[PDB]
């Protein structure tokens, strides 16, 4: 699957997209979120991008909610200086997709269902782990209650 534009400044990809320096520059991406503990920060040595690692493991029983606010601040940082941001994990199917869905629910005010449908329409391969789906559902509750 190709790199997925979500918003003009937000792109959802896999570990191969993170290696595509030509695409990254063409899309004015200046920021990179890596949602794994174990993948490299590709192109770090080139001194071109600002990076953020959210060190998610390979276990589906893990807590991703704890990374939401950190990721949100970084995305707003990129948006506020007029650059794009690439968020990726290994396949762009579960870990990175969950954070993107969470972002759309909080900062675009979409319901979980519409946020999921929005990303799924653009990136048909997404399929967040069921434990991640439950955390998003609790996040939706928290947003609706003002928490």
Domain boundaries, the chain: 4-144
Contact criterion met (CB below 8 Å) for 3 and 11: yes
74 vs 16: CA distance, rounded Å:
22
Burial class (CB in 10 A: 0-12, 13-18, 19+), 24: buried
For 110, phi then psi, to 5°, come to: -75, 150
Q: Is 89 a catalytic residue?
A: yes
SS3 140: helix
Rounded Cα–Cα distance for residues 85 and 130 (Å): 26
Resolution to 1 decimal, in Å? 2.0
| Candidate CATH numbers 3.90.190.10, 3.40.720.10, 3.30.1330.60, 1.10.760.10; the one for domain 4-144 | 3.90.190.10
DSSP state of 38: S
Q: What is d(CA 140, CA 49) in angstroms, rounded to the nearest whole number? A: 32
- CA 36, CA 55: separation in Å to the nearest integer? 5
Q: How was this structure determined?
A: X-ray
Give 39: exposed, middle or buried? Use CB within 10 Å, 0-12, 13-18, 19+.
Answer: middle
Q: 13: which residues sit within 8 A by CB, 6+ positions away?
A: 3, 4, 86, 87, 88, 92, 96
∠ CA 142-53-67, nearest 5°, is 10
Q: Which of 3, 18, 35, 89 is catalytic?
A: 89
């Amino acid at each position: 699957a190709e790199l997925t534009p979500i918003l003009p400044f937000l792109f959802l990809g896999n570990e191969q997209d993170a290696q595509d320096l030509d695409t990254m520059q063409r899309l004015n991406i200046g920021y990179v979120i890596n949602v794994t503990t174990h993948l490299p920060l590709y192109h770090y040595e080139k001194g071109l991008f600002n990076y953020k690692r959210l060190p998610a493991t390979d276990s589906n029983k893990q807590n991703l909610r704890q990374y939401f606010e950190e990721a949100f601040e970084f995305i707003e940082e990129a948006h506020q200086c007029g650059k794009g941001l690439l968020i990726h994990c290994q396949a762009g199917v579960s870990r990175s997709a969950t954070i993107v869905i969470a972002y759309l629910m909080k900062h675009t005010r979409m319901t979980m269902t519409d946020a999921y449908k929005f990303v799924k329409g653009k990136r048909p391969i997404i399929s967040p782990a069921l434990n991640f789906m439950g955390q998003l559902l609790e996040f939706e509750e928290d947003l609706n209650n003002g928490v």
